[PDB]
UniProtKB/TrEMBL annotation, chain A:
Residues 13-226 form the SGNH hydrolase-type esterase domain. One of its GO terms (molecular function) is phosphatidylcholine lysophospholipase activity. It comes from Bacteroides thetaiotaomicron (strain ATCC 29148 / DSM 2079 / JCM 5827 / CCUG 10774 / NCTC 10582 / VPI-5482 / E50). Coiled coil: none annotated. InterPro entries: Ester_Hydrolysis_Enzymes, SGNH_hydro, SGNH_hydro_sf. Pfam families: Lipase_GDSL_2. It comes from the Bacteria. Keywords: Signal. The keyword Signal applies. SUPFAM superfamilies: SGNH hydrolase. This is Lipase.
Amino acid sequence: IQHPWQGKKVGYIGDSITDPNNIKKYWDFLKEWLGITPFVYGISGRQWDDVPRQAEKLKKEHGGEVDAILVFMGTNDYNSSVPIGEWFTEQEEQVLSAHGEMKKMVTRKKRTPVMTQDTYRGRINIGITQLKKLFPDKQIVLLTPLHRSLANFGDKNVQPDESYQNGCGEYIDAYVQAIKEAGNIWGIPVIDFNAVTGMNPMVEEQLIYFYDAGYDRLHPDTKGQERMARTLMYQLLALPVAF
Amino acid sequence: IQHPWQGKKVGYIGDSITDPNCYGDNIKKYWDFLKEWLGITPFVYGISGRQWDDVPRQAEKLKKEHGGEVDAILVFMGTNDYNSSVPIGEWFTEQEEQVLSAHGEMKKMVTRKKRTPVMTQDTYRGRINIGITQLKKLFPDKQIVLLTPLHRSLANFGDKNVQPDESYQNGCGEYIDAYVQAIKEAGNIWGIPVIDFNAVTGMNPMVEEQLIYFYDAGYDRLHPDTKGQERMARTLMYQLLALPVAF
Amino acid sequence: IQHPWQGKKVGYIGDSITDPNCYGDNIKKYWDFLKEWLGITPFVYGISGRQWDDVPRQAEKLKKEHGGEVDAILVFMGTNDYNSSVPIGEWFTEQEEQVLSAHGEMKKMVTRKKRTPVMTQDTYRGRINIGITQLKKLFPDKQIVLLTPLHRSLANFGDKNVQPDESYQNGCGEYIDAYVQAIKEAGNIWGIPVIDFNAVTGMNPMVEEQLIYFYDAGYDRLHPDTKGQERMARTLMYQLLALPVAF
Amino acid sequence: IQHPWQGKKVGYIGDSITDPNCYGDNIKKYWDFLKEWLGITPFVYGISGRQWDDVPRQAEKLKKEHGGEVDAILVFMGTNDYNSSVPIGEWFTEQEEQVLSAHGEMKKMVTRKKRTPVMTQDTYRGRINIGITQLKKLFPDKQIVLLTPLHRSLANFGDKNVQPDESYQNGCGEYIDAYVQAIKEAGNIWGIPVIDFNAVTGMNPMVEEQLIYFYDAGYDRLHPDTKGQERMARTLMYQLLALPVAF
Amino acid sequence: CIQHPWQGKKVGYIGDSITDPNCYGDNIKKYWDFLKEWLGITPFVYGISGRQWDDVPRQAEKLKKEHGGEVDAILVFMGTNDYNSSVPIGEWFTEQEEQVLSAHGEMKKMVTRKKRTPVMTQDTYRGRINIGITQLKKLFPDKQIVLLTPLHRSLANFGDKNVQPDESYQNGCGEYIDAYVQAIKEAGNIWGIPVIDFNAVTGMNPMVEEQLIYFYDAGYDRLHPDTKGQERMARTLMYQLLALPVAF
Amino acid sequence: IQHPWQGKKVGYIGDSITDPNCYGDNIKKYWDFLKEWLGITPFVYGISGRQWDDVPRQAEKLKKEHGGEVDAILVFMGTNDYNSSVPIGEWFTEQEEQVLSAHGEMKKMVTRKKRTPVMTQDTYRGRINIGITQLKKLFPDKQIVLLTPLHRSLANFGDKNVQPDESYQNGCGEYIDAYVQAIKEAGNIWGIPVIDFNAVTGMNPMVEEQLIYFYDAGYDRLHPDTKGQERMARTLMYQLLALPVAF
């Protein structure tokens, strides 16, 4: 058997942990190991509300080339205190239904996805919708956000470690779980990177995988990026690219 | 390493999405692609419209006709239980009972809450309890895997067969979700592997652009077309890589 | 693609199901099959009767004896915590705290709930917290994987050691389920991979026909026999395909 | 201090042990003694052979005939549910539902497991659910008290009415215990006071010397005789001292 | 105006040292002595230091013999010594399928039903309770008989051969005092007898140092209540018994 | 007989249902009725929103301000613990210990399992342990009684304070039942009387007809109105008859 992602062209959507612009990124290792041509759209500080824009740029510049897409986003939504929100809104409706006898109008509760940039769930609904609309025939995979600790970049950018809830009373857990739940909600594969990478900066001995123990226990260093890449390599073995 | 399912004989249990007769030769089934790609001989028992209450029968028919040669079994069922408004129900019933127990002192009857699985075909969970029981009973030494139901949209097959899309609850106040999650839950409840097909296939007819994987945008957004079947087959190929057949 | 675990040195932490001495030579253990099939050198520390509170000790002994050569670690523990009625407990305690925060404006002291892991051996989650912490502190750059406990039925080892099947809650009012689920939950809580062995092995002694995978149909439906160990090993072989060893 | 039930009007719901016609005037009933001792006017609705499924009916008749007069209500029922092999059943059914909630942050729909009372005459717990609901609906501002059934022994009334003593389970595998405990449990489940008559009366026909409190040692160790009724009445007199009538 | 139902009645008191008139001699005024004073209740006391539930029949028999025609009610305050002496809890019944005649509308016929039989043995605590309540009801079937649960207890040291750890420890057969308290409470429904949960209602817990004011010796005896404890017990009993008649 | 609580001075510990500030003069509280009926002087410490973790503070304030005057104490707390999703936890922790024991022969060290109460405010049972310890410590010679929380329904107090009715589990997966039962269990665990107010009041807002006892059917089916407070007071009056104050 051969690796299904070997020699494929892949679009990478995300934040600074994916952003090309001191640290060699995971997609660069995959390029070397599996010959995967990378189309990187991840940008520093971006959140799930930026998924549609990144997807659109990918479509515009490489629509006829890209084979698969990986979405690694969400840690910034947590940091920016983006309210989790709701997946759907629901209400009674009347609809034609038939199961053995003449069809007739019946009352059935109907749900409608909440399409808003105001909430995390809303952003995920909008993002996945756009991804499927633009790339309906491609392999699209979501990766959950990594564990994170303290990060201090100046007097206007101070991020407490993950033992703290953010400004809207949520732990990073809610931002990780929403992505995992999106798998069944929208019908899309999810790689639980948060867990499978085995990287947790809350355990100081594992800070060997992060940028600087003194002020940045959020961004992985090259060593962490390589462990992420190797993890992704075997986790992707379970998903085809060419159908 | 070689694919653990290559050259094996597999029983396929399910409904129309597995039925070789679904729309005749106008839809090539996933097990057909697997046969071509991995040399997997298919023993197909899926039949259009069948529900989880039909798993025991299909399992027994598989046992009777190919019990001495089948290597593994895939169960892809449940979307019709949703459409037919089968109440979810509960997994077990509980009650304080006495049982022989010892942890340091002389053994004796002690009272502990005991759970007993609900064996009834009146509920979805009951049907699953009965179905998995029959599967493990007839094929105790085989690799048996459950596949979760696919996302689904509108389906109209005449005035007596009209199925609203999945944004609507069915007749017993449940969304398709309940039937998908019950199968996932069965993994730990019964000790059986589950492939979350609902998610990994990446096929959602609720997004019209992906209707390229379903039969007819006008009246059938429930049954995958050949293109969808091939995507399902390719998905299965790599998802099955994580499970052995020959122990 | 070559198996990532091929030819690696692995540490096996656990209980009797891992212990080389379980029924002596009457049972060939899963790690022995892996040694033969994948050339994986085993450093086994599992010991009969041990619980999650023994994980740090085993991890430390592994570090002391093979720290410079071990490549990966598998933790297969918890069924004894269930039998010994160890309360599940809580993962964290929490309270409002003042912390420096800044998102666009001058940093200021703000009020935010802060959680702290419960580090006690009095509870299951407490033991898991302590265990995973020690594992990560000792082997921060290694591949460490947790395996969930297998389904289990009755066992009668002597006048003072009789263990009811899994349809019964233990002495602290919990089903085996809680001990399986807590390990799965540890995946996201601590950032560690988990192989849901409880489900993927497809071995459930509660279904009599599957007792072919356990040691004694009359007195021990808890410990797998060689046939069960091999099914376990083959399952692990393909489940581990999704995880790298050499980073 | 004066007895809170003195001079009050009370509705008595139950079976033969309450029915004034039980063996005609050969037996003086407990409410009769209470009428004499405390001036409690009785509105009796208990009828021989009635079960908990008849509570709503008796309550409605009481309401219809003395609604504007009755001060309190006593429900002494269940022994016939035992003799008629009425399955205990379940108190509630549960499932995940969406509900508005807020504890510090903006209110929103959250998922929480919700329980719903099982309202059915097919089970004992179901009957209790329906009965108490009706009692509270009809007399929301009254003192309503439940009394657990008395211990019981053999009862033979012809070749077609033979009731084994309480050392035997009934036709649905339950001891009288289950029907007593269900009532005690209803105290907290529904929010209603319960007098454990089963214990406090001190009357157990299973001990032959105490058959002095039952109708006939030869064929009726189920129905109390006048002596037993008086002991019950006196017990009730002091047990009711702990509950107000006029609020 | 309601009168206390136990006023002027004659009561038999069955139990152990906490009931024994000889407990520390005249250094302790017992609960039944206070009830005699407050309610004019004549006490027939049979409690003896160190006795267990296996001694209930003997005490009941002696009560019947000496005061059978005088006694109106009976209180049984026993069990703390069963805990201290590591008496196994045991089982209430044994069960087996039996054939029995039953009829519910149609001609009676033999049917299979599980039948239970109480375990009558002095080898276990539950067995002793079965034997004890049976004898109490056989001897005094028309009397008010009430069971009292054992009191919370702490350390006690009565010499080189009599040392009792506090209730935070299991006894010699792996049981906490809890098991001996609960078995009595359960007997209420099992046998049809009222039980006053003295263990809780007295509000006396020697495990809380500040409440040792109710026990005899802070340094050597946190098991036996002192007069102050006996009075709180009696006063508690006075109002708890208000709920039970004596004269039927 | 005279009421044992007549003319006594009582401390009332609890939450808003006890707090005199609850809706101010719009609600006359239970202790106010008891003052008028039995001449009981009230020393009220209950405060809106408080939980069992506040019992030690309220007990100490009562001690400080009325320690030489108070005769008895009632503790009516817990409903907010439910609302605030406080985990139930465990009563004790256990460990094998060596202790001096003698039963007929020369004393010596033996191995016995020893339990230690959990003294943490992180769990409900821990809070009860801490609270009852404080109560008995400061008032060792007083009559102290616990009252179980009342049945409750929905409450909506603004955008950030919305409480679902009791048919829903709280934020930590527990029904109100758990917080009611733990208090009942405290009786034997700590040796303290418990009045099961949850049942004896007969007040259940889940039965709409009984909402006559609660503040507002529209937004407050949690707090009893004056009519509810009076029924509660009347219930307490006769329930307290079984407990002495002056020993």
